[PDB]
C-alpha cells in the first residue's frame, strides 16, 4: 500500500489527503528520538526505540511546552502562531508529505520552524508541505525541537543540561532523514535545509557545527542568520540564566546537580511562568535561553570560524523582509499600537532606542540616534516610528545576514540573495508594520494557491516563483531554470554582491543590501563599544 | 579744505579719489600706534604720540611682516592675496575712505581683513573700501595689526609677551575710531565692525572680550567664528610653540627672558623661516600663532562665556561660502591639483580625513570616514573629493559658526544668517574648487561694479544687493528696507533658523543650515573623544 512505509525504525502507517484538488500522501507525526520527560528533561535527547507493529502516522503530534502569546486574544494575526495542539514535554516527532504516486528518489527539503528559540510549532498551518510537495513534487519534511529552557537550559560542565540540547534534536531528525527518507522515495543526498528566525538560525548553525555537515546538500535562510545579536549566548550567561531562573522557583542553589533536580522536579508551566525574568536588561527582540557557544557543537566561536573558513562549503540561498522590526516594537516598544498609525514622539524615539541597543552605553546609544534621525525633521512622528523599526530590523537581521553572507560567500560554491519587500493584501495587521517578520513563509508553502484564502492573482502568481525558487535551487543549487526564457536571478558575489527583490513586480537586481547602515552596525558599533 | 582733517592726535592731509567717474576722499595711513620695533616687539601696542604738522596720508602704508605665499608665482588667484608694499615691522596703520561732500555724522564700518592670523593687509585691491564708501554712503575704515609670531607669541606670565596682541592692535585701532571718526564725517556711536576668515573670528572675538564691547554697535562675522578650532589655543600650547619656535633659531631656553631676549634679536625673516615647524601634528587648516585663551582678553574659556551669555548683546548678521574646504586641500591634501579634476582615490581621502582632523584618535577618524563616505559608491573619485571638501569646510568653518550663531541667538538682539552659493564667473581657480573661501569679498566691496573686472550683469546686481545689505544693517541693524517692495530676509530665530542664500537668484529661505553634519560636529565628535 502506499500508505504504509517500512523504515529502519518500524513500520508507518500514513493517511492521503487533499489538496488543489488532487491528493497526496500524509506520514504525520513519526517519532524520532525518545520522550524527552522524566530525568530526561535538559538531556540530550536518545534515539527512538524500534517498534514492533504498524505506527499510526495520520494524525499531528504534540506541540512542544512553550510559552503562549496572549497579547491579542482572538486575533487571528498572532494566534496563528500559536500552539494548535496539546502541549507536551514528549514532542519529538517529525511529518513527512510525500507526492503521489511516490517518487522513486526525489528531492528533499526538511523544514525548521521558527519562533525566538522559545516557541514554535511544526503543526501551525502556514507550515503545511502538502501545498508545497504537491506544487513542486518534492518531499517535504517538518521536524520539530525543544524551545525555552526545555531545550536550551545551559550549565556548561554537566551532562545532565549540557545545552544546545534543542540544536541536537533537529540534528536527530535530521539524521532519520538521512537514515530513512529513501524509502519515503526521497533521495538522502539531496536534502536542503530551510528555516525562518530562528530556524534561519538554526540553519546557519549546522553549516557551521561540524557534527551537522554531513547530513544535508544545500541550505536556505530565511530572516535570521548564527551570528545574530539574540541567537546565541556565552556558557557564563548561560550558567548565570540558569542559576537565576532557579532561583525564581526557590531553588537550592549549592550546585549543579542540587539546581538541576529542583528544576526537574517542576511542572512544565511552572519554568515557563518565569523564564522571561532572567534577561540581564530591560531589552526589545531578545530570548531568555537560546544557544550557548560551548566548544562543542561550536569548535570555537561564531566569528572565528566564519573567518577560517571553517564551515561546510556548499550553496545557499537567503534574504530578508523590508521591516523585519516592526513586530517587537508593537509588542515591547512605548508609543506603538495595534490599532494606531503608533507615530512615535522624540522621548519615546529615544525610550526605543534604549531598549533595542540594551548592551550600549550611553555614547552607543547616541551613536545610532545620531545615524538614525533626520535633524531637519526631527519631530516627525512618522520618520521617529519609521526609524525605530529600521534600528531593529537592521540590528536584529539584516546587518548581522548581510555580514554572514559576506563571510560566507568567500568560500562558498554560491550565493543568492533576496529582499522580500510586498505586504500581502489580506494580512490583518496595521499598516505601519509594513512587510512583517515571517509574513513571506506563507507565499514559500504557496497559501496563495487556495482560493478561499483571499490572495489577489498577482500574490498567486508570486507565490509559484517563489516556491519554484526554492525546489529548483534544491534540487540544483541554482533557484534559475536551465534554458529558460525568465528573469535571471544574478548570484551574489564578493564583488558585485548583487541581489533582487522578491514582489509582484518585474523582477530588479540591485546591490549592497543597506550597506550604509550594515557598516555602521557591523564595523563601527561593534569597535566603538570596545573602545568605550 | 575737505581733505584736511584735525584729528585728536594732529591734522591729516587725504588726497582726492576717482570711483565709478565720480570722486571720494581718501586717507590712507594713518598712524594709531607707536611703531611696535626693537624692544617693542612681541610687546603690548602703545597709543601714538601726537604730532605737530600735517601727516601726509595720500598713500598706502606698508604690511605687517609676514608669510608669503610663493606657491603659484605669477598666479592671479593666489598673489592677490600676498602683500603689495614693503613689509616693515612699523606696520600699525589705518585707511579712512570718506564721502564727497564730507558727512556730518554717517555710519561707520570697520574691516578687519583676515588670513589665518598670520597673513593680511590692508592695502589689497579687493579691500578698496572706495567702491562701497561712494555707493553706499558710509564712511569706510579698514585697520591692521600684527600677524604671525610679531603678533600671537604667547609666553603666559611675562609682560614681554602676553599674547593676543595682534587683538590689542584692532583693539586700538577701534578706540581711534572711536575717538576720531567724528572729525571724518563718522558718527562714533554707530560703528559696524566686519570681518572674514581670522577676521570674523577677531569680530567674534571683541564680542566676547569685556576691554572691546564698548568700542562698537553691530557685527558682521564671515566665513569666521572665535570658537573655531585653528582660532585659539591654551596658554599652556601657546608657551609649547613660543619655546619650540626658539628650539629652530638656537636660542637659550633656560627662562621666558632669556628667550624672548633671543627672539627680539632675530630679524623678522628669520622667525618666518620656521614659523611652520611648531605644529603639533601634521595638518591643515591650522596656523602656528594664534589667540591664546589667556584669562585677560579672554575672562573664561570661550564655551562657557558663549553658555553664560557672557558677552556684547546687539546685532550681528552672517554667513558662510558654499565651499570653504577646497583651498586648504589644494595645498595641502594629496591628490589635489591646481590643474587637475583632482579625483580622490580611498587612499588619499583617508590620508585627508587624517589631515582634516589632526586631534582625533583612530576611533574618531572612522567616525568622521564613515559619516563622510556614500558606500554604495565608495570608489567614486569625484565623491571622496566633495566629501573631503565638506569635511574641512563642516569642521573649521560652517559647524563651528552654527555653534556661535545658535548659542548667540538666545541673547542677541537680532541675528541675520546667510550662505553664499554663487562661483563668480571670471574665477581663475578650478571648477573643482567651487565657491571658494573668501570670494564673497569682491562682491561686498562691490567690485563687480567697475566694467574692467569682467563680471556678468547679474552679478552686478548681485554686489549691489549685498552692498545695501551690509551697509543697510551698518546703520539700522536690519538688512531691509523699512517699506521696501523687494524680498525680506527673514531674522534668524531659536525655534525657525531661517537664513537665505546669496546667490544671482530670487531669495529663497532656508532652515538648518546643514544640521546632520553640524550635531555631529558639535555634539557627537566631541563627546566621542572625550569618553575615548
Not at 518534492?138 to 554537566?158: D, E, K, T
Not at 560567500?409 to 517578520?437: D, Q
Request: aromatic share 12%.
Amino acid at each position: 500500500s502506499e500508505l504504509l512505509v517500512n523504515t529502519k525504525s518500524g513500520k508507518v502507517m500514513g493517511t492521503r489527503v487533499p489538496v488543489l484538488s488532487s491528493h497526496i500522501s500524509a506520514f504525520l507525526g513519526i517519532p524520532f528520538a525518545e520522550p524527552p520527560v522524566g530525568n530526561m528533561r535538559f538531556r540530550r535527547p536518545e534515539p527512538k526505540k524500534p517498534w514492533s507493529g504498524v505506527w499510526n502516522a495520520s494524525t499531528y503530534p504534540n506541540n512542544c511546552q512553550q510559552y503562549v502569546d496572549e497579547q491579542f486574544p482572538g486575533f487571528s494575526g498572532s494566534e496563528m502562531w500559536n500552539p494548535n495542539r496539546e502541549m507536551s514535554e514528549d514532542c519529538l516527532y517529525l511529518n513527512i508529505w510525500v507526492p503521489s504516486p511516490r517518487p522513486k528518489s526525489t528531492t528533499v527539503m526538511v523544514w525548521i520552524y521558527g519562533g525566538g528559540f522559545y516557541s514554535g510549532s511544526s503543526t501551525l498551518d502556514v507550515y503545511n508541505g502538502k501545498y508545497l510537495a504537491y506544487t513542486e513534487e518534492v518531499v517535504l519534511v517538518s521536524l520539530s525541537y525543544r524551545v525555552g529552557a526545555f531545550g536550551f537550559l545551559a550549565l556548561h560542565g554537566s551532562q545532565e543540561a549540557p545545552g544546545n540540547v534543542g540544536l541536537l534534536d533537529q540534528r536527530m531528525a535530521l539524521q532519520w532523514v538521512h537514515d530513512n527518507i529513501q524509502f519515503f522515495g526521497g533521495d538522502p543526498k539531496t536534502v536542503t535545509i530551510f528555516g525562518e528566525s530562528a530556524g534561519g538560525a538554526s540553519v546557519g548553525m549546522h553549516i557551521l557545527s561540524p557534527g551537522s555537515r554531513d547530513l544535508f546538500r544545500r541550505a536556505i535562510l530565511q530572516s535570521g542568520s548564527p551570528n545574530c545579536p539574540w541567537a546565541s549566548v556565552s556558557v557564563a550567561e548561560g550558567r548565570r540564566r540558569a542559576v537565576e531562573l532557579g532561583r525564581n522557583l526557590n531553588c537550592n542553589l549549592n550546585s549543579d546537580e542540587e539546581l538541576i533536580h529542583c528544576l526537574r522536579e517542576k511542572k512544565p508551566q511552572e519554568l515557563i511562568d518565569v523564564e522571561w525574568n532572567v534577561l540581564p536588561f530591560d531589552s526589545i527582540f531578545r530570548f531568555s535561553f537560546v544557544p550557548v557557544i560551548d566548544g562543542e557543537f561550536f569548535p570555537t566561536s561564531l566569528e572565528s570560524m566564519l573567518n577560517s573558513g571553517n564551515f561546510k562549503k556548499t550553496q545557499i540561498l537567503l534574504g530578508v523582509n523590508k521591516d523585519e522590526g516592526s513586530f517587537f516594537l508593537l509588542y515591547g516598544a512605548p508609543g506603538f499600537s495595534k490599532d494606531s498609525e503608533s507615530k512615535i514622539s522624540r522621548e519615546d524615539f529615544m525610550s526605543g532606542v534604549k531598549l533595542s541597543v540594551p548592551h550600549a552605553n550611553d555614547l552607543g546609544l547616541d551613536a545610532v540616534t545620531l545615524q538614525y534621525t533626520d535633524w531637519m525633521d526631527d519631530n516627525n512622528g512618522i520618520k521617529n516610528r519609521d526609524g525605530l523599526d529600521d534600528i531593529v530590523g537592521d540590528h536584529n537581521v539584516i546587518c548581522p545576514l548581510m555580514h554572514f553572507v559576506n563571510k560566507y560567500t568567500k568560500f562558498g560554491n554560491g550565493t543568492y540573495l533576496y529582499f522580500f519587500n510586498h505586504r500581502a493584501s489580506n494580512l490583518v495587521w496595521p499598516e505601519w508594520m509594513g512587510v512583517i517578520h515571517g509574513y513571506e513563509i506563507e507565499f514559500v508553502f504557496g497559501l496563495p494557491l487556495v482560493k478561499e484564502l483571499n490572495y489577489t492573482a498577482e500574490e498567486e502568481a508570486l507565490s509559484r516563483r517563489i516556491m519554484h525558487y526554492w525546489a529548483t535551487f534544491a534540487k540544483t543549487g541554482n533557484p534559475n531554470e536551465p534554458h529558460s526564457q525568465e528573469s535571471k536571478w544574478p548570484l551574489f558575489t564578493t564583488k558585485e554582491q548583487k541581489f533582487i527583490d522578491l514582489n509582484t513586480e518585474p523582477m530588479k537586481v540591485h546591490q549592497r543590501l543597506r550597506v550604509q547602515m550594515c557598516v555602521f552596525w557591523n564595523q563601527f558599533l561593534p569597535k566603538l563599544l570596545n573602545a568605550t
